[model samples]
Structure formats: C-alpha cells, structure tokens
Target: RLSAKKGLPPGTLVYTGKYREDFEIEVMNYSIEEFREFKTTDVESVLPFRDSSTPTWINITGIHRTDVVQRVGEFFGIHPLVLEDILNVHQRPKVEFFENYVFIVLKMFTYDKNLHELESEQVSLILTKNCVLMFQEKIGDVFDPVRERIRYNRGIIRKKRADYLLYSLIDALVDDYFVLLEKIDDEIDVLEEEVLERPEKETVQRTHQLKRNLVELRKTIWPLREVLSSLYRDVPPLIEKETVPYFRDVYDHTIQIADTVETFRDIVSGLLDVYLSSVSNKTNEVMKVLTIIATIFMPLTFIAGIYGYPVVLAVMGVIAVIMVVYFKKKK
Candidate 1:
C-alpha cells in the first residue's frame, strides 16, 4: 500500500483503501431546541454547517475518494498530515491534538459470519468547536446508538456540547469491543472443551485461527489505552473538563479489553499442547491393542508348527482363551 506513496512528501494525500463508486455524507445537526438530519453527495453543501451554533456530526461513509476528502479537509482547516493519515487506512489507533481540533483514529471490528473471520475498518474522528467529522471506509458502522440518541433526545447528549458528542462516539466504539470479545470468549471456551474431549485435525486449525484473531485484537486494542489516556490526562483543548471523566471511563474499558486479550493469548497458546497430548494418547491406545494381539498370537504360531492341524487348532483356541483370562485378571 505504501508503494504508491513512495518518494512523496510527508503530508501528501494518497487513497490507500479500495476504490468505490458511491460516496455520501450523513449530517446530523442537533441542539437542545432543534435537530436536523440529511444526506448529501456534494461536499460543498456541508460547509455551511461548519460554523453553526449547534453541535453537528458529519459522517463521511467512504474515504477512497481523494478529491472529496481533500475538499472536506480544506474546508475544515484539517492539517495535511491528518488528511494523509485519514486516506491511509493502515494507520495505528492513535490520537493527535491540533490547535483547532482533536483528531482520533480507531479501528472498528465486525465478525464476518460467512467467512468466519474478523473484519476491521479504520474510523477517523475530528472534533472541532461545533462539529465532529467522522470518516469510515465503508457504509456500515457501530454508531447507530449515538445517532438514535441524537434523533430522539433520549439522554443529555442533545444538551451537551460537541466534546460530549465526541465522547459518545468513542464510547460506542469501545462498547462494541466488548461485544466482539464476548464472541471470542465463547469460541475459546468451545475450543478448550474440544481440545480436551475430542480434537480432530480441524480442531487444531480452528484453534490456530482463533489465535490469529486474538493477535489482531491485541494489535487493535493495545494502542487505544494510550490514546484514551492522552485524552484523559492531557485534556486536549477540544476536550472539556467535565468530559475527562467520560474518557477515563472509556480508558478503563480499554484496559479491561487489553487484559482479556492477553489472557486469551495464553489460553490459545496452551490449546496446542492440549491437542498434542490428546493425539499422542490416542496413538498409545492403538499401539497397546496391536501389541496385545501380537503377544497372544505368538505361542499359537509356535504350536501350529509342531502338532497336526486338528490338535494344533484345538490347542490354539484353549491357549487364546486362557491368555485372555490371564490378561483380564492382570488388568
């Protein structure tokens, strides 16, 4: 992906994500007295709400359009470096403080049911005085609850300032981490039981797959602790004093997630050993039965070599029965 950006300046804008045909911006401008929601394909239409008195959330659903991203960045006074990071979706989860805005990058994950894998997308948030600009690589997101609260005035979000809106969006993203973790937790439990009870070849494959997913989770979540801590401790200009506590709460959730991911890594690593020992035990049982059969037949073959056919067969039957009885007693 970085090959395209080679020999370019640090602040150069290059669209590194997949290209798409459709691009849309969803705007939600709400205050204590009024709320308005609309969708627009033109970036120029959104410029009017930049300086509006109300707290507005402008969610851009596609980042592959470099021209559109450039226009939005120019209009919002977003630095070229920030725009570069936004276009390059491979950025790590981080936070940056600018004079006019606080920029935050986060990873959103969804479990792919058909593929049985985790899908991740980079979400960039720019918090200004009256607007919060969110950029996503695709259409779907985990921000529906935040949208619903803004639409229905369900809580104090409508009454709060733009900083609280930023918090709500971050809180929503962090909360969804728990949902993904719970799914992983159940899979780990199932794999642990399978490893102990009956581990097939496919069981090991699934274990490895789960281990890879946990590693991705760690890479995505580990940096978020520092991001939240920066917001909570440093208290950036865009972040209000009252909102520091909310960020702290989200920081605690990040710590919990990081701890859980570490624990899962340990459990998944142990699963390989469990699988090996069980397979070895199975082999030993098969070997034991084969060796016992060979031991029982050894004397029968020697008798057949010495006596006539009828006498040899009769002796062999008696000997086999006696050997089985002796072995059973020994057991």
Candidate 2:
C-alpha cells in the first residue's frame, strides 16, 4: 500500500507507513563508564541527551504520528526531504550524507514460522556525531544485541564513538539477513524433496511463493551494496577511520547475501521446470496406453462389421491371439 504524493511540494511531510494507536519513544544513554535508559511520550524530554558528551541512542518505535516525527526532525535540524523519506515506508534502501549527519534507510525482515512467510518493515537511522537516532515501525528490532552490549559493556562498542555504534547497528541488521538466509536454505532443501517425490499443485504454489520472497528480498537488499560503498568511499565526517573496516565487513556480507539469493532463485526456477516436465511426462504415459488399446481393438471391430457368422468369429479369434503375441513381444 502507498499514498498519492503527486501535486504536492517536494518537501511535503506525509506519513505513508502503517498507522498505530500511539507512538512509543525510548532513549538509551550510555558511555564506557555509565549507562541509563528512559522511556517517555514527550519529545522534549529526550532532547537533553543530545548535549551530552557520551553517545545517546534515541529509539522511536512508531512513525505513524506525524506530529511527533516532525518534532524530532525539527529538534535535530534534519533536512526536510530526509524526514519525508523516513516517513515513507516504501522508500528504497539508501544512504544520504547530510551536512551534520548521515541518513540511512534499510528494511528489517523476520521469518514468520506460523505463516511460513517472510515479513519486512522499514528502519531509518540518522548517524550524528555523538548520537544515533533510529526510527522503526515497531518496538522490537534486531538491535537488541547492540543495546545489550552497550548496557553490559560486553565489547568495545561502549568505548568507541557513534560511528562505531553505527557500525554495530548496521552489523546487527546484516546479521539478521543471514537468519533469513538460513531459513530459506532449509526450505530449498525441503522443496527439492517435494519436487522429486510428488509434484502436486500445492508444491508448485509454495515454490512460486518462495521464489517471490527471494525476489522481494533481492530488490530490497541489492541497493544496500551501493549505500555501504558510498559511505566507505566518501568517508563522511560522522564515520570514524577506525570504523571503516567494520563497514567494509558489512559490505562483504551484502555481497554474500546477494550471491546466496541468486542461488536460491535458480534452484526454485529449476524446481518449477522439473514439476512441469513431470506432469507432462505423466500425461504422455497415459496417452500411450490409450493408443495401444485402440490399436488392439480396431481390427476386431473391422472383422465384426464384415459378417455375423461362425467364420467371422473364428477369423477374429485367431487374429486377436496373434495380435496379442505381437504386441506383447513389442512391449
């Protein structure tokens, strides 16, 4: 689903994301030596962390409330176009370097076990000098590990600047990509068995659905390579030299994911072809049997049409026995 943006000004603010009852705002303030967490609905309450020397991660759960998103955008002095893209969930994955911060939009995916489907949502991040602001469609995200690392000082994430923090967030998202990859890989194995054993209508439908999922994933993920490449090549002021290697690692991951997606897509395509050939092969076998039966009965019918006497019966009987022996030898 998308909204009509035609006839509107370039910087017009429109909330194209799914609507929610209320917006959720969470703030995480942390340093190598200290840690704190805050939750509030008021936007102003989260502004004090911006001036702190330590890094702050402002995590906003919902973007449907336009007024709240506007307030945060105004507070950070974000570009109007950047804010607009943040609200538009259909935005392609991209990275934009602004005067004061780096804006990045990416999609997060989760494989639904109950439905046996993949679900995705948009996640936008503004990487600033001492703070990283993340806006997601909902509360839960793959960034929880990064948050825990910051809270417990598990790794060097707490010691690094916001750029390293940015790397951690991006790394977390990429790590989740592998999760989906693993699921799809297993499904591909299962599909192989189904295609070989019994290619039913349901099997074809499921293969098609999975193929579509791979396509959707590919479309969303392929652009990320350019985004990471640009960030690394340009070396934005917000990104640190030390963190360059981390993003390079993530870039390599994007390439791996792209290759894996292609592999699965090819496998799915092959499965579809196999199913078609199997069905066609089955039809041909049936037709061949029908033709053989017709071949055996044609002569017998001809003999009956000539005469209805004992001679006709004797001739047809001998001819039928000979025909059976010949056909049996041929078979």
Candidate 3:
C-alpha cells in the first residue's frame, strides 16, 4: 500500500491502511444551553458547525476514503501535510501546533478477548477554534464515556469550550490505556504463577508473547508521553490555560502507564530465567538417577563375564545385595 506514495510529492494523500467499505460522520454540537447530535455523509453539512461558536465534535470514522478526507480538509482549512498524516494510518504519536489549529496523532489499543491478541488503530485529532475534528480508522472507538458525559450532562464538559472537549477526548484515550494495561497485568500474573508451578513449553511461548505485547505497548505509549508533555509544557494556543491542567493530568497518566510497561518487561524477562532454571533442575535430577543405576550395574556385568552360570548368578546376587544395602545406608 505504501508503494502508492513512493514517488508522490510530500503532501500527496494516500490511504495506506486496511480497506473499509463503510464511511461515517457523526457530529455532536453542544453548548451549555443546547445539544444536537446527528450523522451525515456529506462534508458540506459540517460547514456551519465549523463556523459556529458552539463546541462541536465532528468525528469522521473511516479515513480510508481519501476523497472524503480531502473534502473535509478543504472545508476545515486543514493543512495538506496534516491531511496526509491523517490518511497515513501508521503515523507516530505526535503533536503539531499550527497557527489556527493543533494536530495530534495517537494510537488506540483494544484487547481482543476471543482472539487473545491486541488490536491497534490510529486516531488523528484536529482542534480548531470552535470544533474538534477526530479522524478514526474504524466505526468503533473508546469515546463512549465522553459521549455519555455530554449526553447526560454528567459534569462540566457541556459548559466548557472546544479545548476542553479536545481534552476530554484525549483523556478518554489515555484512560483506556489503563484498562488495557490492567488486562495485560492480569495475564502476566497468570503466567507468573504457571511458570513457577510447572513450567511448560507453552509457558515459555506465552512469556515471550507477553514480552512482545509489552514492547508494542511501550512503543505506542512512550511517544504519547512526549506528545502530552509537549501539550502541557508548551501550552499551545488551541489548548486553553484552564484546560492545561487537565492535559497535565493526562500526561501523568501516560507516565504511569509507561512505567508499568517497563516493570512488566522486567518481570517477563525474569520469568524466562525461572523457566530455564526449572528445566535444568529437571535435567540434573534425571542425570543423577542414570549415574546411580550405571554405578550399580558395573560389578554385576563383570561377575557375569568371568564365571559359569550358577556361580555367576549367585555372585551377582550377593554383590547387588551389598550395593543396595550400601546405597540405602548412604542415603
């Protein structure tokens, strides 16, 4: 897929992700006094929301359609480079402060219970004066909690501005990291117990698998810390002074998650050591038993080689009895 962009110009738009047929656009336009939620496919319908003073969240699900992405970029006055970044689903987590808006790219991870694997999607966010535009790769997202807060007026989010809405979206993404890490931690615990109790080949495979998952988690989260750090430390114009603290709080959560990833990495590495020791100890036990059997058979074989049948049998029996008694006494 990336070959399509090999010779293109710097800002050429190419959708380099898995193909998805369905495209969607959902808008949540809200203020302290009013709220409107609707879905539309046409990008033109969002022009009024982009221009409105009320806080609006225009979530565009499915960036695989370059035409829609290009049209949305044109409608919102987004930079071509930013739109390219949105189309390229493999973008690293980053934050860019433009004159009129801020662009952020982050990864969202979901643990697939049935598949027993992790699934990741790229999420690109653009924060404008009165609108927060989110571009996602698929239909589902981790923003349901934020939606509930808006729909039910659960907190002061309805009263806040677009910057706060941007913060809330990011906060939701970071919050899900905690959820994913908790699941990973539980898996690590189970693997730890298994490794200690009775190490198996499957246990080693799982330990390596857990290590790999943590590595991916670390890759996704470490850059996010830098992104959030830049947001809180530099204080971009799009992010209000009031909302800076909230961004800082999210930054701290990213820190905690990164630390947890590191700790899990160490623990997984130690599990490998435990597995090796257990296997070697089992080998040593078998070797000692084999050597003891060989030592008892040595004189019996000699007596059988030298004597006639009856004499050899009696001598071998007497020698075996003496050796058995000696071995038992030594033990």
- Which candidate has the highest lDDT of all? 1
- Candidate 3 lDDT by residue in tens digits, 81-128: 999999897767999988889999999998865345887989999998
Give the CA lDDT, 0 to 100, for residue 244 in model 2.
86
Off by over 4 Å in 2: 113-116, 297-331
List the candidate 3 regions with Cα displacement exceeding 4 Å.
Answer: 1-4, 238-240, 309-331
Clashing residue pairs, candidate 1? none
All candidates: TM-score = 0.92, 0.89, 0.90
Deviating ranges (above 4 Å) for candidate 1: 1-4, 19-21, 308-331
Worst 10 residues of 3 by lDDT: 1-10
* TM-score computed on alpha carbons, candidate 3: 0.90
Whole-model Cα lDDT of every candidate shown, in order: 0.87, 0.83, 0.86
Give the higher-TM-score candidate: 1 or 3: 1
Backbone clashes per model, in order? 0, 0, 0
Evaluate residue 253 in candidate 2 and report its C-alpha lDDT on the 0 to 100 scale.
91
lDDT of 2 by residue, 1-331 (tens): 5667678888877777764755788888888788899789888899777777888889888888778888888888898889999988886899988788999999999887535698788999998768899998877789988878987889898788888888889889988999989988888888888886786878887888888888998898789777777777678664566888888898899889888888888888888888788888788878868877777679888777665478778887888788778867754
On residues 145-196, what C-alpha lDDT tens digit does candidate 1 reach at each position? 8899999889889888899999999999999999999888888888889898
Model 2 residue 90 lDDT score: 87
